[PDB]
Amino acid sequence: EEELVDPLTTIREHCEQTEKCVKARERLELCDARVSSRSHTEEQCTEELFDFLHARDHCVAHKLFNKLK
């Protein structure tokens, strides 16, 4: 009963489980995994990350404002 939640993080969830977001969130961890294990790599998962957020947030926008006032 009345527990204040930021619609953002909620809609952030709903999107992360989406054809594009998932086929991306996966693309990241894969990077991260290898990049993290490796000790001598110049690699960075920036790209991948953006790919995700770019997708996530797009989604977020399309709905996030219906909740806010």
Partner: protein, 80 residues
Amino acid sequence: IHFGNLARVRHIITYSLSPFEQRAIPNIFSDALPNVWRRFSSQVFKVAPPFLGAYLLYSWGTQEFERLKRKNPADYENDQ
């Protein structure tokens, strides 16, 4: 004086009617449009081509630029 010295013109008749006696924008369908098309048609294959031919280069140029930003996994296949 700029009206009279112009040129020697002979045997030409012209008939025209006051604006009030005739129509404002006459035959929009039977004459207008058909010509608006005619005109359009005739030129397209002159104008359009290069403009279109640019959209390509713009696209390839741009598109290809982005591609050169993404990293090539081949640089990192033996960084264990």
